[PDB]
Homo-oligomer: A and B are copies of this chain.
Amino acid sequence: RNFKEGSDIEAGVSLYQIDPATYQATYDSAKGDLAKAQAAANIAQLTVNRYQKLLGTQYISKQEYDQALADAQQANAAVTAAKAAVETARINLAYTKVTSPISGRI
């Protein structure tokens, strides 16, 4: 219990502590996939970036470059997905606790 009982507190200043142990890794689980999310997507990024240089050049095969650029498009979307996963977790981790957005006598 972080606060001083009966004192007055600002908003969102977290004076209690849940055990993060469960969630704390839980946040990490998303933080893991996000990396996995960015990872697989990052490589896609490089893939298109390379191919893009191919653009106008021979092998590009506008379809295929598009295939990766999708993968770019596709992967990064997953990137956005995991980022929230991290986000949902974080807001579920640093969620704890303080406090009633109101800032007042506790």
Contacts and interface: CB of A to CB of B under 8 A. Distances in A.
B88 A26 contact: yes
Interface in A70-101: 70-71, 73-75, 77-85, 87-88, 91-92, 94
Given A43-B66, A50-B63, A66-B43, A78 B25 contact: no
Interface string A7-24: 000000000000001100
Given A22-B91, A91-B22, A84 B32 contact: yes
Interface in A24-43: 25-26, 28-29, 31-37, 39-40, 42-43
Q: Top 6 nearest A-B pairs by Cβ distance?
A: A32-B80, A36-B74, A39-B74, A32-B81, A43-B70, A39-B73
